[PDB]
Amino acid sequence: SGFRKMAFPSGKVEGCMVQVTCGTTTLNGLWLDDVVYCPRHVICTSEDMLNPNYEDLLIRKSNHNFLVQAGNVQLRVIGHSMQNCVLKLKVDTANPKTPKYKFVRIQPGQTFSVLACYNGSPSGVYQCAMRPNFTIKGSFLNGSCGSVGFNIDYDCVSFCYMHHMELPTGVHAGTDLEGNFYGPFVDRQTAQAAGTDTTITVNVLAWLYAAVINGDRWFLNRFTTTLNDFNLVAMKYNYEPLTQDHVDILGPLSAQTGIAVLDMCASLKELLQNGMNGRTILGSALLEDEFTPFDVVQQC
């Protein structure tokens, strides 16, 4: 019993974290086999970040200008290449601690664990979601760039996020491990405004299912609804539209609890209309959207 924001055990990723220094920028890199992956902005000065020509800046750099440190031990960089917004630094030593891994590009609303690092060293772990506007609400200070987000599925680490930027609003942007940004964001210190941060409706429903599992039932009402009638409500509360694909994904939690998905949708509509009246649900005073259906099943 009980229900926590639960991250994957971080040990497999800790063994992959290194320090990358270029000139006088230090950040974190990910060492898998004989490649170190890091944000390409490692090559930029402060002034460069205002308006960087990455191809031009990369002309000035050779293999020996990339200082890679794994603990207290120096890796020899034997090649480098830019792939979208990441650098790949070929090193002469394969990481002996390399886990089984893949690179995956997640969808908006998918969750992951972050291992926030500074100077190549693990600081801490927490859960995140890919917001529908393609930002995350991380905890990242100066030096945390190159910290990664991941899921562990079947003892295989699926890397989904590398940290690049903090927006002026203090939310976070980054790439997949092919170096493609999530959303419209660029690795430039310029005005970048996030769009509407909508609520991940399918996740809220999963968490309501989690609450019923755990004995928090007060919010279950006597109504049902339709996907269209629900969605007219969802849209006025900046909730994402629910699809029949969402309903299908909730089926196992429906089966477990005996609560039809549309019934749970009607309960959520009443919570949106009437609020929570100073009550809580799984110890939250608001509707939590950073648990996926799969996250709930895994935890329960």
Added chain:
Amino acid sequence: SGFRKMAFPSGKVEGCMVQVTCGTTTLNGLWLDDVVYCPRHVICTSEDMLNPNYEDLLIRKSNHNFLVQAGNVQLRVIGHSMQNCVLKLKVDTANPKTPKYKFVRIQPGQTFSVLACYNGSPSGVYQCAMRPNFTIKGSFLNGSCGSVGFNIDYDCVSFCYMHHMELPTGVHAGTDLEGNFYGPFVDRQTAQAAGTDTTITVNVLAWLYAAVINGDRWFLNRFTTTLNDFNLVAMKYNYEPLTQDHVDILGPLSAQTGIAVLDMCASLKELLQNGMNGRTILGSALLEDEFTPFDVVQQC
């Protein structure tokens, strides 16, 4: 920027988790050097847990009745002893992955990271606090007993919690690593009622300091208070009494923000009296008490 419930990296503890089976109870043990620590209720059947005589039950057990598995590899138990509510199983092999460690008995209101395990295998990590009634609000299913709570301080793992029990109310009880329960709880399946779950006032203040650091300032008022006047308020809201030791611990966060501790106390009094009016603070609709002053400084 941003502020998360942040756990320590779990890798150092993952390397210590083993499976312990006695008869047909399986749970988790902690392998440090040549000792495995686990809950003594490993020796109990279901029926035994109603009213166990641990000394008598232990008469029936020899070293070979304790099956200890580290991954896919069997440890030889060469001695065993009961220390309060834990068993210590001496094994013939020192754990090669043993970190620098200590055993510490924390105070009520102190926080820690939990690595929830099943069958000796890491499942996930989250933060907890030792409630003032000496329960924790974990996430623990059947098989999770022996999962540990810890802090990492200076690359030394300080073990503070081993999981033993779920109360009928679905909160959790356990021991330190000397096997002494936190609070009045016993390793018996009997009616055990927790006392009043009060709020950890010093922690709330730390989190208000965290919010100011991160730019969430709306709740700062124009008042001050006194420790006595504050505490008359705290007591009616089942908040723990604030002491001058608490004020002293908040000094660094006071210094950073320029907000005198008693001023922040007055802000909290208004939040207790008037509530939050549907607003949030560091994305919580309620006052969060599971960050210590030290936790905030570490994260910021």
